[PDB]
Amino acid sequence: DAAKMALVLEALPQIAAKIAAPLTKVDEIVVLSGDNSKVTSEVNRLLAEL
Amino acid sequence: GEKVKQVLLAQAEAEKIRKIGEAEAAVIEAMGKAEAERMKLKAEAYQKYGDAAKMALVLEALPQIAAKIAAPLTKVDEIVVLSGDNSKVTSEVNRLLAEL
Amino acid sequence: GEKVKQVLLAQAEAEKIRKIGEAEAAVIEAMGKAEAERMKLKAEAYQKYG
Amino acid sequence: MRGEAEAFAIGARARAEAEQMAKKAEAFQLYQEAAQLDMLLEKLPQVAEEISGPLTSANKITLVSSGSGTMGAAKVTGEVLDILTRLPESVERLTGVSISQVNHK
């Protein structure tokens, strides 16, 4: 069983690398969280902008 | 002249492949016996590890596993943490005595 | 002239690998014994901490 | 001539590879849990490397939190460890060998 486990442990990195390859094409990732709403609170006046 | 020449040189190519094949087999065999001694000795030593030693192996693996997990955070740009209430609360105070 | 030369120099390469291998094994062994003394002494002192 | 000679090279190499596995198979019988543990500890960061590596190619990531939630890095880092943890439980479906040092079976 320790030898059978070694064969699998050697195959995992191989199988993992081929599965994860498409992630190289990821560009943007946006993680919203905490509430299920469109919450745009932003504070600070425009004392001079047109 | 073409036939005897081609035959003599084809035998040389075959002699090379056979000699190299035999030398390689002797190396692969010897290397296997040396590697098996590592596996045996490593096993006979590891079999005696106490819980403080087993904890040391894991504690040494955590930083390794952690570094590879956290690597993608290097690409983080913006992070905005709203808090305290679940609403769009834009209160801003101060007059525009002169802005158009 | 090509054969005797290649054979003599291949033996030199093998002699170098063997000599370096033996010297290295002696260092690894000695270093292990010194490091084990640290672990032992550190343990025998830490075991007395209040 | 070349074909007959190559068959001998394959056969000579075959016999040497077979004795390697024979002695490696005998050595594996000595791998108690204290030794098996190291096999997992060595290949856990390697599986994380081939999963995280291609993900690091990402050009930009943005995290937004609100009200009750966490910040976000926990979600991002979590997915890498999740894909790594999902894999061994995934191969087990097409071959009953275990990649979990006892604990369950």
Added chain:
Amino acid sequence: MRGEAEAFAIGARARAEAEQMAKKAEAFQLYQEAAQLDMLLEKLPQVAEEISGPLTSANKITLVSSGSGTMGAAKVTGEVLDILTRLPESVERLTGVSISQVNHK
């Protein structure tokens, strides 16, 4: 010649590495809790370094508070410590060894 000679270097090196682990294994039997504690204390900031380090690459962070809530730095700093704390409890799932000095088991 080079192959036969290299096998001896592997074997010589193997015997030395094995005696290192043998004497290191005997030394670990003396590690009572007062000594084990230091193993955690040394590697806790190291795990925090490899988790926080890549997160410091962030270009900008903005924190907004309202009504009842906290300011926000507590959430941000909290996530680093959370990912660090989540990890040991995560590896325990694929190997039953403990990374918590007794207290529970």
